Write a protein that binds this DNA or RNA. Structure first.
Length: 113
RNA sequence: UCCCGGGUCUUGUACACACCGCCCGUCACACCACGAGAGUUUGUAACACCCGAAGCCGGUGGAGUAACCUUUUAGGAGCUA
Protein backbone atom coordinates (compact mmCIF):
# COMPACT_ATOMS: atom_id res chain seq x y z
CA UNK A 1 0.00 0.00 0.00
CA UNK A 2 1.57 3.32 1.01
CA UNK A 3 4.47 1.62 2.91
CA UNK A 4 4.00 3.93 5.88
CA UNK A 5 0.49 2.86 6.80
CA UNK A 6 1.70 -0.70 6.22
CA UNK A 7 4.79 -0.36 8.41
CA UNK A 8 2.75 0.87 11.39
CA UNK A 9 0.01 -1.77 11.07
CA UNK A 10 2.05 -4.94 11.33
CA UNK A 11 1.84 -5.41 15.07
CA UNK A 12 -1.96 -5.22 14.89
CA UNK A 13 -1.95 -7.76 12.02
CA UNK A 14 -2.55 -10.96 13.96
CA UNK A 15 -1.64 -14.06 11.95
CA UNK A 16 -2.19 -17.54 13.34
CA UNK A 17 -5.39 -18.33 11.29
CA UNK A 18 -6.17 -21.02 8.68
CA UNK A 19 -6.87 -20.35 5.01
CA UNK A 20 -10.24 -20.65 3.28
CA UNK A 21 -12.39 -19.34 0.43
CA UNK A 22 -16.13 -18.62 0.15
CA UNK A 23 -18.22 -21.72 -0.06
CA UNK A 24 -16.83 -23.13 3.20
CA UNK A 25 -18.66 -23.78 6.46
CA UNK A 26 -16.59 -22.54 9.39
CA UNK A 27 -16.97 -22.82 13.16
CA UNK A 28 -16.12 -19.61 15.01
CA UNK A 29 -15.45 -19.29 18.76
CA UNK A 30 -16.16 -15.77 19.99
CA UNK A 31 -15.49 -14.46 23.51
CA UNK A 32 -18.52 -12.58 24.82
CA UNK A 33 -18.58 -10.98 28.27
CA UNK A 34 -22.31 -11.65 28.86
CA UNK A 35 -22.44 -13.34 32.24
CA UNK A 36 -20.79 -14.15 35.57
CA UNK A 37 -17.96 -15.80 33.64
CA UNK A 38 -16.54 -14.41 30.42
CA UNK A 39 -17.73 -17.33 28.36
CA UNK A 40 -16.90 -18.56 24.85
CA UNK A 41 -19.86 -19.03 22.51
CA UNK A 42 -19.65 -20.89 19.21
CA UNK A 43 -21.17 -19.94 15.85
CA UNK A 44 -21.56 -22.28 12.89
CA UNK A 45 -22.42 -21.36 9.33
CA UNK A 46 -21.33 -20.82 5.74
CA UNK A 47 -19.07 -17.97 4.51
CA UNK A 48 -20.33 -15.36 2.03
CA UNK A 49 -18.02 -12.42 1.69
CA UNK A 50 -14.38 -11.38 1.29
CA UNK A 51 -11.13 -11.86 3.15
CA UNK A 52 -9.19 -8.98 1.57
CA UNK A 53 -8.61 -5.27 1.94
CA UNK A 54 -5.46 -5.14 4.06
CA UNK A 55 -5.57 -4.96 7.86
CA UNK A 56 -9.31 -4.17 7.72
CA UNK A 57 -10.57 -7.26 5.90
CA UNK A 58 -13.77 -8.87 7.14
CA UNK A 59 -15.62 -12.10 6.44
CA UNK A 60 -19.33 -12.87 6.72
CA UNK A 61 -20.92 -16.09 7.96
CA UNK A 62 -24.64 -16.89 7.98
CA UNK A 63 -26.83 -19.65 9.36
CA UNK A 64 -30.48 -20.67 9.50
CA UNK A 65 -31.04 -20.41 13.23
CA UNK A 66 -34.62 -21.43 14.06
CA UNK A 67 -36.50 -20.54 10.89
CA UNK A 68 -35.16 -16.99 10.63
CA UNK A 69 -31.72 -16.56 9.10
CA UNK A 70 -29.02 -14.55 10.83
CA UNK A 71 -25.73 -13.04 9.63
CA UNK A 72 -22.52 -12.05 11.39
CA UNK A 73 -19.58 -10.04 10.06
CA UNK A 74 -16.27 -10.23 11.88
CA UNK A 75 -13.07 -8.20 11.54
CA UNK A 76 -10.55 -10.92 10.84
CA UNK A 77 -7.85 -9.69 13.25
CA UNK A 78 -9.94 -9.17 16.36
CA UNK A 79 -8.82 -10.37 19.78
CA UNK A 80 -12.44 -11.52 20.26
CA UNK A 81 -12.25 -14.51 17.91
CA UNK A 82 -10.58 -17.35 19.79
CA UNK A 83 -9.96 -19.75 16.92
CA UNK A 84 -11.43 -20.73 13.57
CA UNK A 85 -11.84 -24.31 12.35
CA UNK A 86 -13.26 -25.68 9.11
CA UNK A 87 -16.04 -28.27 8.68
CA UNK A 88 -16.56 -28.81 4.95
CA UNK A 89 -15.31 -27.42 1.64
CA UNK A 90 -17.53 -26.47 -1.29
CA UNK A 91 -17.46 -25.52 -4.96
CA UNK A 92 -19.40 -22.34 -5.66
CA UNK A 93 -18.10 -20.71 -8.92
CA UNK A 94 -18.43 -17.27 -7.26
CA UNK A 95 -16.50 -14.89 -5.07
CA UNK A 96 -19.44 -13.43 -3.13
CA UNK A 97 -22.57 -15.54 -2.59
CA UNK A 98 -25.53 -13.27 -2.14
CA UNK A 99 -27.98 -15.62 -3.81
CA UNK A 100 -28.35 -17.67 -0.60
CA UNK A 101 -30.23 -14.76 0.95
CA UNK A 102 -33.42 -15.91 -0.76
CA UNK A 103 -33.13 -19.70 -1.20
CA UNK A 104 -35.21 -21.76 1.12
CA UNK A 105 -33.92 -25.03 2.56
CA UNK A 106 -32.96 -27.56 -0.11
CA UNK A 107 -32.04 -24.92 -2.67
CA UNK A 108 -29.59 -23.33 -0.22
CA UNK A 109 -27.42 -26.46 -0.20
CA UNK A 110 -23.88 -26.33 -1.54
CA UNK A 111 -22.15 -29.50 -2.69
CA UNK A 112 -18.89 -30.83 -1.24
CA UNK A 113 -15.59 -31.38 -3.04
C1' U B 1 -150.88 -0.56 7.99
C1' C B 2 -148.91 -1.74 12.99
C1' C B 3 -145.30 2.10 16.58
C1' C B 4 -144.80 2.60 23.21
C1' G B 5 -147.99 -3.28 24.85
C1' G B 6 -149.30 -8.45 24.67
C1' G B 7 -151.39 -14.60 22.92
C1' U B 8 -151.00 -19.16 18.79
C1' C B 9 -149.16 -23.93 15.00
C1' U B 10 -144.27 -22.90 11.68
C1' U B 11 -139.33 -21.45 9.84
C1' G B 12 -134.15 -19.70 10.56
C1' U B 13 -130.17 -18.83 14.40
C1' A B 14 -122.69 -19.09 15.12
C1' C B 15 -127.48 -16.04 20.97
C1' A B 16 -128.68 -18.80 26.55
C1' C B 17 -126.09 -12.03 31.29
C1' A B 18 -131.37 -15.60 24.95
C1' C B 19 -130.87 -8.60 20.69
C1' C B 20 -129.66 -3.47 26.20
C1' G B 21 -127.09 -10.50 23.30
C1' C B 22 -123.02 -12.36 19.86
C1' C B 23 -118.48 -11.11 17.48
C1' C B 24 -114.81 -8.18 13.34
C1' G B 25 -110.43 -4.79 11.68
C1' U B 26 -106.25 -1.04 11.26
C1' C B 27 -104.78 2.83 14.87
C1' A B 28 -102.23 3.78 20.85
C1' C B 29 -99.32 1.92 25.03
C1' A B 30 -96.58 -2.91 27.14
C1' C B 31 -94.36 -7.90 27.33
C1' C B 32 -92.82 -12.15 24.39
C1' A B 33 -90.70 -15.71 20.30
C1' C B 34 -89.70 -15.37 15.07
C1' G B 35 -88.38 -14.23 9.18
C1' A B 36 -85.68 -10.40 6.04
C1' G B 37 -81.06 -7.12 6.97
C1' A B 38 -75.30 -3.39 4.50
C1' G B 39 -71.96 -5.73 7.26
C1' U B 40 -68.90 -7.86 11.05
C1' U B 41 -67.39 -12.41 13.91
C1' U B 42 -66.31 -17.58 15.49
C1' G B 43 -66.11 -22.72 13.72
C1' U B 44 -65.92 -27.58 11.36
C1' A B 45 -65.08 -31.01 6.92
C1' A B 46 -62.20 -30.74 2.52
C1' C B 47 -59.51 -29.64 -2.49
C1' A B 48 -55.41 -26.95 -5.34
C1' C B 49 -49.98 -25.70 -5.14
C1' C B 50 -45.41 -24.61 -2.80
C1' C B 51 -41.83 -25.89 1.74
C1' G B 52 -40.61 -31.91 3.25
C1' A B 53 -38.62 -32.96 10.15
C1' A B 54 -38.36 -38.26 11.33
C1' G B 55 -37.88 -43.63 8.67
C1' C B 56 -37.46 -48.96 6.54
C1' C B 57 -36.67 -49.67 1.21
C1' G B 58 -33.66 -47.72 -4.05
C1' G B 59 -28.42 -45.13 -5.28
C1' U B 60 -24.02 -45.22 -2.08
C1' G B 61 -18.11 -39.19 -5.06
C1' G B 62 -15.14 -41.85 -0.45
C1' A B 63 -11.99 -41.06 5.67
C1' G B 64 -12.25 -45.52 8.58
C1' U B 65 -13.17 -50.58 9.20
C1' A B 66 -12.73 -58.32 14.17
C1' A B 67 -14.64 -63.01 11.70
C1' C B 68 -14.14 -65.83 5.77
C1' C B 69 -10.08 -66.18 1.10
C1' U B 70 -4.86 -65.47 -0.55
C1' U B 71 0.84 -62.68 -1.34
C1' U B 72 -1.85 -62.69 5.78
C1' U B 73 3.85 -56.72 7.36
C1' A B 74 0.46 -56.41 3.51
C1' G B 75 -4.41 -56.33 0.66
C1' G B 76 -9.11 -58.22 -0.12
C1' A B 77 -14.69 -59.66 0.41
C1' G B 78 -18.65 -57.77 3.68
C1' C B 79 -20.26 -53.45 6.62
C1' U B 80 -21.43 -48.71 8.87
C1' A B 81 -20.23 -43.08 8.12
Amino acid sequence: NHKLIEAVTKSQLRTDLPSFRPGDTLRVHVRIIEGTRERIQVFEGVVIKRRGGGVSETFTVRKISSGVGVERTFPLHTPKIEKIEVKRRGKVRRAKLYYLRSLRGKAARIQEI
